[PDB]
Design a binder for this molecule. Sequence first.
Ligand SMILES: Nc1ncnc2c1ncn2[C@@H]1O[C@H](COP(=O)(O)OP(=O)(O)O)[C@@H](O)[C@H]1O
Ligand SMILES: [Zn+2]
Lengths: 210, 535, 103
Amino acid sequence: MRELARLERPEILDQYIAGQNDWMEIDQSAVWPKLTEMQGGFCAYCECRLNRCHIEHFRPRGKFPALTFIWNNLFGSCGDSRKSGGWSRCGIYKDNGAGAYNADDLIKPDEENPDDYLLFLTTGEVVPAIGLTGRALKKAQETIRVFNLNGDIKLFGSRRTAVQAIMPNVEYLYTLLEEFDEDDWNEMLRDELEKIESDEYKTALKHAWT
Amino acid sequence: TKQYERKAKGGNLLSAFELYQRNSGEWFEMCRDYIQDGHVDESGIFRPDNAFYLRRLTLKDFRRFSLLEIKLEEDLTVIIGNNGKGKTSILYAIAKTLSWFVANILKEGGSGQRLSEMTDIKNDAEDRYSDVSSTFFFGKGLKSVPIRLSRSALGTAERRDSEVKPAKDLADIWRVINEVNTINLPTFALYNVERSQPFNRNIKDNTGRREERFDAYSQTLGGAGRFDHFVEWYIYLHKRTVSDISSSIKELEQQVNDLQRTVDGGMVSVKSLLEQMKFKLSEAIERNDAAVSSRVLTESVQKSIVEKAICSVVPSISNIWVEMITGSDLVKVTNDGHDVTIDQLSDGQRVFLSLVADLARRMVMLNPLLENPLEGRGIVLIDEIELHLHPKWQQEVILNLRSAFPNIQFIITTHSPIVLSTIEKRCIREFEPNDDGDQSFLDSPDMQTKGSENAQILEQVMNVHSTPPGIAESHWLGNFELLLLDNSGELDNHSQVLYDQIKAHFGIDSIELKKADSLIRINKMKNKLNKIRAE
Amino acid sequence: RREERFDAYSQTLGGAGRFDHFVEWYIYLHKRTVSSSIKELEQQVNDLQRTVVSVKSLLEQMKFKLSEAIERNDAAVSSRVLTESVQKSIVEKAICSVVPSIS
Ligand SMILES: Nc1ncnc2c1ncn2[C@@H]1O[C@H](COP(=O)(O)OP(=O)(O)O)[C@@H](O)[C@H]1O
Ligand SMILES: [Zn+2]
């Protein structure tokens, strides 16, 4: 997952108030363009390309009705219940598939940097980062469990495939460290990391390159 | 004689048995201990000290084979090949040989199955006969039990006789020792593609042949199993578990006593009924005694073992039980969380249930002295193990079977790379793809299959491309790469068109497009290097 | 199994004279007799095999004739038998001579 830069609150959230109003009332096409600015047409939790998608409350509307029209709590997740049932990661799984969970011990990607907690092995698994103990380990282990970041075969398979496709280019660049001088080589690595902003599963591709 | 005594004391089973036969205690006990002794492993599994397995098979002028020699593993051998390579022929040859053991365990001088003059002789055999030669192993005391089945063609220049005496001799040891004192017996079974068949609901509970121990050998090598026999046997077990026989004896004893008092009181009309009840009591006691005498697992325990086996091995089945619906007894299953009848199961589920149930029934019946009867010895042949199984089940089937039946030698045939991904290359015997029936020796593949990717097994072991060659789109990424290499790594008009076609057909987040993108990036970097080096 | 001379004694003293057996046997003999040294036949089979699509039917017929000749050659002196064509002719003559109104 990426560290996300939340910026400005959209105007429509000013009007609607918790208790009286419901999420069925509010227009969703008003909210999207700021999330699409924030995230870049990519999922908040898994970093797939968004096509079937929904506005996700990080703390859910049932348990936390206070945080219903609050800009910090909203995220663009993959999957859409309205179109087609049986989606098994991220927003939909957090509710249905993952059982009990404590909401406090999860990586909220606007607040926290994921990179400290999560590591992306080139064999395709996401794991806790090297040397976590106690509470930070519990957050890493539960973010992985509750968003189903390994247990979905579609996601795991797609992520492995992508990283394995670039691993020729990774090995070939690091050989040419020796022959090239530093300014040439550091320009090349900048240029490859420039590409992967526009790519799916960017954090996994980042860990392969750096 | 002194020589037999020396060999017998050296641990030779045949010599010990011959001394037993001539003197007909010590020699009997030696033979019994050879068969019965074993130990419990570190894993808690019983292991016989003297294992029984097929070691080698040779086929001469048999069906497609002019000459074929196969070494088999003690635990698991998997035979793979294209259609029409003779995988089934190999299993049939083994089954016919095993029939000679079964026949002679059942009856002295029983005859097993012979080779067919019409089908089993190779069509262009110069010698106009066929031979199936097998060598079995039974512990260090009996390292070699050679058997040969032979059949001459119809035109009959000379008769070639089968040599089956060693099979008979060994089977005689099992039969005779068992007659004196109950021993555990080896299971032999063949499961061919005929195991797939419709379930008849009309459970004809016959009389009570299904309760007899040697019913376990009935139709063992016929290919289908007898799932109907299982159902009848299982319902029988259920009825007996719900009703204790001793209470019936106690009740019958009380009824006999009450009737005897009435006859003693002057009511001569009930004397006929007393005699009938005394007969029934004697029969009940005898059955109880025979049950007691047979040292057999209780019906409750037998039921539990089989239920556990089925539920462990068959993924969709969590529970199996007997209902008393309306009048008739019905076997029900919890399948995918729902209670259904056997007739409501899918064909895949039923076929696999049938295999495991049948095998478990036979093992329980043949291994009464084992704490876990499924840890008995035997040889089981399974054709097309993946028959009707979804890929997910194919990933679990071998593991589940070997866990449930740890001392059975499995000889299996498969077309499934998914199955092969769970098996070591040492267990695999592959036919060469261009085998025109003259390959003397089946061999292990070069690549390790266990833990390998499916795509690699397909290409390296099964000689099948990862993409279908008869589809144009299957070639596009390859062609794209060639175009890139032809134009010094630069994306020309032709490469761009094909790139767009790939993108349009497979989609923006397709593996194919990502690979294409990767190729562009690596080629650009290679060219940049080349320019820097030139300057 | 093939026919052999002492099959003439099979079921001779009960079960003989069944119409269905005749019809089956007669059709069989007809099929065989529709369309001769072994070495010459072996040479002809070899020549025809070398030529082999249109001659494939002829090759199969000649291979059958060769096999039959070898079998007759291999067959024992005690089990000596007339050709299937001759057998057929004799039976036909017998039927036509004996049976009322069948010519
Ligand atoms: N009597 C025979 N003589 C020669 N070839 C035979 C004979 N019987 C069967 N075959 C060949 O054996 C093949 C069938 O072998 P089989 O064991 O069924 O193969 P599979 O490995 O697909 O199970 C056929 O392709 C056929 O050509
Ligand atoms: Zn997602």
